[PDB]
Structure 1
Amino acid sequence: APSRNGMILKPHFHKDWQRRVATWFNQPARKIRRRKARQARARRIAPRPAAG
């Protein structure tokens, strides 16, 4: 039962998108991992700056 005047779209949900699911679980985990990697790099290069 299609409704009255409105916008039209092409909802790409005909495929099995439940198979390929990749949602953002590790956003703050990736941020803390990049923070620790940057701190380890800054402690590795002692005279060199952060930019280089």
Structure 2
Amino acid sequence: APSRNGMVLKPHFHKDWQRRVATWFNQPARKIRRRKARQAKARRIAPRPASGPIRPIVRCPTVRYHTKVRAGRGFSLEELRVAGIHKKVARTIGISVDPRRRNKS
């Protein structure tokens, strides 16, 4: 029963949520494992960049973010063509390629 003023609340705890609860006690261990794997991979590829291949300059899709620019999946086929790079050699030299992206501007 409600008592005096207060928000009308709808808790979603009618469905035996106790059996499916995600506890995050292994969060710092997960962070350490991720860091160690990062260091191991960077050690494995010694002169190459540790982060990964160069990603393209890409504008954000919707009207909320189109003023902003982020990184894309890979350089387009047309970009590679006019840059003079074979699309099967770009990936080996460390360039991400996104075949399914077409240019409009």
TM value normalised by structure 1: 0.84
Greater relative contact order (CA < 8 Å, ≥ 6 in sequence): 2
Q: Deviations over 1:32-52 (max 9, x none)?
A: 0010000000100011011x9
| Structure 1: runs of 5+ lacking an equivalent | none
Q: More strand by proportion, 1 or 2? A: 2
Aligned-partner Cα distance in 1 for 2:48–2:39: 13
Q: Identity across aligned pairs (percent)? A: 94
- What displacement does 1:19 show? 1.1
- What displacement does 1:22 show? 1.3
| Structure 2: runs of 5+ lacking an equivalent | 51-104
Task: Give the secondary structure class of the aligned counterpart of 1:22.
Answer: strand
- What displacement does 1:8 show? 1.1
Q: Structure 1: which 4+ aligned runs deviate by more than 3 Å?
A: none
Number of aligned residues: 51
TM value normalised by structure 2: 0.45
Aligned-partner Cα distance in 2 for 1:24–1:46: 34
